[PDB]
Structure formats: C-alpha cells, structure tokens
C-alpha cells in the first residue's frame, strides 16, 4: 500500500508539473494576446466570429 502511495504521489506530481506548464501556457497565451494586434487579430476574431455564426445557425 505504501508502494502504491509512491505512485499516487508520482501521478500527483505529474499533474502538478502539468499545472505549472499550463501556467506557462497561460503566460505564453497572454504574451500572444499582447502580440495579438488590435486590428489584425481583431480581423481574425471577426472572421472566426463569422465562421462561428455559420456554426451557430447550423446549431
């Protein structure tokens, strides 16, 4: 049972490192949001909204 507790801690630490990597993903995503232009990425957002509007009418 104690040996199984070690693998429990191993999976928990794998998820903790995954959570820190997701924090780094949030960091890189915020960096991309800053490097997401107020007109270019806005045009991408409008086009994605139009495609999602077609998807919504299909929904």
């Amino acid at each position: 049972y104690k040996n199984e507790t070690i693998q429990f801690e191993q999976q928990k630490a794998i998820n903790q490192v995954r959570q820190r990597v997701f924090q780094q993903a949030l960091q890189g995503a915020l960096g991309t949001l800053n490097s997401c232009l107020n007109n270019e990425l806005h045009l991408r957002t409008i086009n994605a909204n139009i495609g999602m509007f077609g998807a919504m009418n299909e929904i």
């Binding site: 997701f22 957002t45 909204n49 509007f53």
Partner: protein, 178 residues
C-alpha cells in the same frame, strides 16, 4: 412571475389591446428617466406623505410631460395600490416585458473589439433563426477580459450564452488535466 413582472404584464397587455404599444414604450422610457432621480422617487416611495398630494403631483407630471393616458391611469392605480414603492424594478422589468410581448429578443453580444455591423446583422439573422423571435435587439459592449472571440448572451435575461474568447482557453485548461 413576480408582482413587478405581472404589473408590467398588465400594462403591456393594455398597451397591446389598445394599440398604444410604442407610445407606452417611449413613455416608460421617459418615465424611468424621470424616476432616475431619487428625490421624486422618494417622494412617491415615502408612505408618510399624503396620498392626495402624491396623486396631484403624479397627474401634474403626467400633464406636463405629455404622457399616455394608459400609463397615467396605470401609475395612478400603482400609487393607489401602494406598489409605487417598487417602480424601479417595475419599469425596469416592464421594458423587458414589452420586449417579450413584442418578441424583441435582446441579446447582449459583448466582445473585445467592436464587431463589423454586418456581422452583427449576420449573427442577428442566425439567432433569429435559432429563436423565432420578432426582433433580435443586438447589444454590444467592449469587454477586455474576453480575449478575442465572439461572446453572445441571449435568452430571457442572460440565460443562453456562447463565447469563444476565454472559453476556448477554459476548454483547453480543463480537458488537458483530465
């Protein structure tokens, strides 16, 4: 189905049967514009001050601001039945009850960028397709926390709501750790 909601429903129904639909609509707009100031609202909300003076003040404001006799008669019934203490939520829901009986589906689509008004009409047609409503009163406001995607919110008040701005990230960060 509250008291304010059903009094709103009575007012919208008498407007609908009397054809005073948009007249009462603009009338409740200027009416809540008048009730915006808490001196006159408190003047009506105070039950200490004499009801005949309150009625005279109401009919006075009615004659001066040139209102519908239907909403005039309505708020006379409201001050009589004492529910004039509630006119804030009464009219604030009456606009939406009027929108309901006129089928106009107010849908607040916030986003991070002021969308092309053709795309506003596009998603307006799409949500009229998904709703069957008479109008879709498209409403927009710039939300900075929304990253990029369209962020609709429709239904009665805020019930049905789709997003693509942070919800995409929420999808990813949720489903990744599973």
């Amino acid at each position: 189905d509250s008291t304010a909601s059903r009094y709103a429903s009575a007012l919208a129904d008498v407007a609908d049967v009397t054809g005073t639909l948009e007249a009462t609509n603009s009338d409740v707009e200027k009416l809540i514009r008048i009730f915006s100031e808490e001196p006159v609202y408190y003047f009506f909300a105070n039950p200490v001050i004499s009801i005949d003076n309150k009625r005279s003040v109401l009919d006075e404001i009615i004659t001066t601001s040139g209102l519908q006799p239907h909403t005039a008669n309505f708020i006379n019934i409201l001050i009589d039945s004492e529910r004039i203490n509630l006119v804030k939520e009464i009219l604030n829901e009456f606009e939406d009850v009027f929108n309901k009986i006129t089928g106009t589906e107010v849908a607040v689509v916030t986003s991070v960028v002021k969308l092309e008004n053709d795309h506003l009409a596009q998603i307006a047609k799409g949500v009229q397709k998904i709703t069957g409503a008479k109008n879709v009163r498209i409403k927009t406001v710039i939300d900075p926390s929304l990253v990029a995607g369209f962020t609709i919110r429709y239904g009665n008040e805020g019930s049905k709501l789709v997003d693509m701005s942070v919800k995409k990230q929420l999808e990813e960060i949720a489903a990744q750790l599973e």
